[model samples]
Target: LASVIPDVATLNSLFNQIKNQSCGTSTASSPCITFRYPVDGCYARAHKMRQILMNNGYDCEKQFVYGNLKASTGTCCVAWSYHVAILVSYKNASGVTEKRIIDPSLFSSGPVTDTAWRNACVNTSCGSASVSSYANTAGNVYYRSPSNSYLYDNNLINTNCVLTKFSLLSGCSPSPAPDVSSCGF
Candidate 1:
């Protein structure tokens, strides 16, 4: 199956839908359970986003950022051993189609370039916080494929997605980290 890259306007429309589907607003009292907040386990969030995007015929994949990451946007700040989000082929301002990130947890306006996403998370106050490695994999992948072919089993992805969701919703704790070993982190 091939991936469809939508125009900027269409991409923005899709992004809005993704953002609007959050369980609720990100207010401290009722933190969002989806795209609205990064606290909801990036792997699960990214996986859910990808499922929606792919169902709509858009090509989406997971982008992972590793290392001690202190990511902040607005009043939301989250530190993680790694973070994951969806990457899609998007038409840029210059009329070029390129890979852009659709992570509402860190960005709100619309799709953002990879560099912009990484830059937004650069906070060195926590002992030289930096991203160690970045990985891209199929949308169906929670971490990585079983082998080097980038092919992942949907069952594994769904299992982890469910686990991540329950863990986050239980109390918004970032515990029970996703299996980064699947991606050879």
Candidate 2:
């Protein structure tokens, strides 16, 4: 027995309904963000960028790094590897934000090594002091205080490739500083 019912139209209608239901759309504008750095600048620029982002209500997290050099081999590389995770705080009342992870290869043309740079950044007063100059070798990097006379720390590689005395002449004015009085630095 052959049924003459028209099933093609019903099938087509079902397919159209499913297609429209599956398709979703969202319309939202992204925030404006910009990053600038000097060709020679490395860690210094990275540090400053992180500070600025944090000041603007962003949350950043540090990831792990691996050392390539071995004491027994006596072979060393002139650069370091760093991984950073940045989370942009949400603006609405819900207080939810997006998260992004970034990993960039840092290469130093000089004699500095990855371990040396990492050590210096972790040990020095990077928030306030300025990087003076990188040592001839990884064993002698230096970090200078704001006074420009005293060394805030020793055995540090210079990372301020982008920032200069003249560039920072305007000084860092945030209009209103973060109220960290309750939280210790």
Candidate 3:
């Protein structure tokens, strides 16, 4: 079974609690990233957290989101989901799949459930790329890219409620974004 992910309302609460939090310290600790908006003045711990999740058997991946309405933060130039995140999935007690966003960037200091991911993600226009592809880090825990631009050539709806939820968000730029183009947008 699937579709046992957490709800948006619940996730929103988690986000609300940490609305204004500061994260990391230096580049070695976090990725050296410039920004499109203001930072909470913290370095990143995303890559490290991702490794942890995968080692424990979570289907996770680094994600990038692009949407002009969105801010700007992510790894890899072509990869633009606006903000980077580790999209993770796991089966629930009933065997239904649940979506959790592992973003140490925010104040979760842990994994943010599906609801948390969407609630605080961004309320702006969709990005240039609108697809996420699958691959893995050197260890092979099975991960997917959250950013459309970085996502190979597969934006299939697949089985992610978070991805589908984003599909519902409106607004696109410079019109005529082919789904399978280089870096999506």
The TM-score leader among the candidates is: 1
lDDT of 2 by residue, 1-185 (tens): 11111232322232222222211212210110111211222333333333433333332332233332111111221222222111112222343232222212222222112344334333223232222222211101122222333221121122222233113222122211223233211
**TM-score per candidate, chains pooled:** 0.69, 0.23, 0.37
Q: Kindly list the per-residue Cα lDDT of model 1 for residues 25-97, writing each as its tens digit.
A: 4421122334433553666556556655755567677777777777654454567666677777776677677
Query: What TM-score number comes out for model 2?
Result: 0.23
RMSD (Cα, Å) for all candidates, in order, is 5.7, 22.3, 12.9
- lDDT against the true structure, per candidate, is 0.59, 0.25, 0.34
Cα distance off (Å), candidate 2, residue 12: 41
Q: Model 3: runs farther than 4 Å from truth?
A: 1-44, 57-59, 68-81, 107-110, 123-185
Question: lDDT score, residue 1, model 1?
Answer: 35
- Backbone clashes in candidate 2 total 2
* Model 3: lowest-lDDT 10 consecutive positions: 34-43
